[PDB]
Symmetry: none
Subunit: 34 residues, 12 copies
Amino acid sequence: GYEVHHQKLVFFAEXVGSNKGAIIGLMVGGVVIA
Amino acid sequence: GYEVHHQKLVFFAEXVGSNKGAIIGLMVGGVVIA
Amino acid sequence: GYEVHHQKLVFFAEXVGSNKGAIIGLMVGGVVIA
Amino acid sequence: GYEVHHQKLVFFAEXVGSNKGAIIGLMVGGVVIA
Amino acid sequence: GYEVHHQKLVFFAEXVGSNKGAIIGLMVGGVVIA
Amino acid sequence: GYEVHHQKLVFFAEXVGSNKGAIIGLMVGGVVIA
Amino acid sequence: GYEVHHQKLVFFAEXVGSNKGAIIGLMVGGVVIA
Amino acid sequence: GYEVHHQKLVFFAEXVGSNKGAIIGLMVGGVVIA
Amino acid sequence: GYEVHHQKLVFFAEXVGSNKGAIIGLMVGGVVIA
Amino acid sequence: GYEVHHQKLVFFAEXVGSNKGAIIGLMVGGVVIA
Amino acid sequence: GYEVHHQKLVFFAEXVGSNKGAIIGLMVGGVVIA
Amino acid sequence: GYEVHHQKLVFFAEXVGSNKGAIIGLMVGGVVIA
């Protein structure tokens, strides 16, 4: 059981060519990349 | 059981060519990369 | 049981070509890389 | 049981070509790299 | 049981070519590298 | 039981080619390298 | 003649009681405080 | 003639009671305080 | 003639009671305090 | 003529009571304090 | 003519009571204190 | 003509009561104190 709160997140991204993965600011869970 | 709170995160990214993985600012969980 | 709070994180990234792993600012959990 | 709080982390990264591992600013947990 | 608090960490990285391990600013946990 | 607090750590890194181990600024835990 | 461009500014403020001055993120000009 | 560009500024402020001056992240100009 | 560029500034402030001066992260110009 | 570029500045401040002067991270110019 | 570049400055400050002067991380210019 | 580059400066300060002068990490210029 996850409990996430009170986050102030700022995400800057520049030049994202041909992205094939995950670009995530805030994530609460699992990540599976093959 | 996770309990995450009160985060002030700033993420700067520059030149992200052909990303095939995970680029995450804040993550609460598991990561599996093959 | 994890308890993470009160973080002020700043992440600078420059020139991320062909990333195939995990680039994470703040992570609370497990990481598995094959 | 982990208890992490009150962190002021600044992360500078320059020239990250073909990263295949984990580049993490703050991590609270386990890391497994094969 | 770990209790980590009140850290002011600054991390400078330059020229990270073909990283296959873990480059972590602050870590509270275990590391397993094969 | 570990109790770590009040750290002011500055980490400079230059020229990190083909890193296959752990490059960590502050670590509180165990390290296993094969 | 001023020429200001290409700024990525993030401003965090906490607990601003009875402010009587100037709290400015980005300013291009003059400031006079009596 | 001023020429300011390409700035990545992050400003953290905590506990600003009864401020009577100038609290500025980025300023390009003159400051006069009496 | 000033020419300022390519700055990555991070400013941490804690406990700023009764400030009567200038608290500035990045400044390009003159400062006069009486 | 000033030419300032490529700066990575981190500024930590703690306990700033009754400041009457200038607390500046990066400054390019003149300072006059009476 | 000044030419300043490629600086990695980290500034730690603790207990700054009743400051009446200049506390500057990086400065390129003149300072006059009366 | 000054030419200053490639500096890695770390500045620690503790207990700065009633400062009336200049406390500077890196300075390129002149200082006049009366």
